Design a protein around this ligand. Sequence first.
Ligand SMILES: Nc1nc2c(c(=O)[nH]1)CC=N2
Length: 288
Amino acid sequence: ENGYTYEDYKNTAEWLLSHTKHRPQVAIICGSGLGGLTDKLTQAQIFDYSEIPNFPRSTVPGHAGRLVFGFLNGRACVMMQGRFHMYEGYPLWKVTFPVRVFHLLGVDTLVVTNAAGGLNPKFEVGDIMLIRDHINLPGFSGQNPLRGPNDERFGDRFPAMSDAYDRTMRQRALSTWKQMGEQRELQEGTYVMVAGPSFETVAECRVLQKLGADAVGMSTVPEVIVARHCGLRVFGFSLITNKVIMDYESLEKANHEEVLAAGKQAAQKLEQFVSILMASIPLPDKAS
Ligand SMILES: Nc1nc2c(c(=O)[nH]1)CC=N2
């Protein structure tokens, strides 16, 4: 919504449609460190957000501000590298502006990745959590991407979200993750979105864990809400990149010397895995 109108999204789509030979079926948003997925694209066309008519431009990081269209493993992707975050200052409706364009691009599935703080103790840095569900800690407050008036053209005024993280794919994913049989389990849980750019206190993590979130991060929910609101099929992962929770003993803090997750290897794993799943995303035109 706000800020943009339909015609904006349309133009944006059109420009991109009339500027890349590619029809992406799938959109992929990479969280921190899952940038590299873009390498796996074949026949990549890169746009700086930059060049795209309405696309929010990045707030600093920038290069890690790119939209690359590509084929990933039997699918017409379009991936965002460096998704936008509220805490950078966009409101939700620039954050999620792309999801709306990908729709108009034709994309019918979105897969969203983030990095996220492990709050379930079951979890070990490097883990991948497949997102079963989320808690929208900003939307409850007003900070929801679909807030202001609703374009019937993209979706219903009150989309449901109980089915957000599409179930079929949660399966193929869980199957697939055993298909190549790796060994720590493919995790699964609720991602709670928390906005702020700073990291949580211990009390904060308590409340988050006791709300039954398993991962905390700051992205995705808005993209997922706006995805689902125009019916994209969605799923995605968090790369657990750290965890805290207990008062006795800050032999440490909550920060970024813990958001590598072993480094490349965890991240690389998620990337393969995503690249693999390409294969499970139902084709569109017909598929059978
Ligand atoms: N809030 C919060 N967000 C995060 C992490 C964390 O430890 N806490 C890691 C990645 N995103």
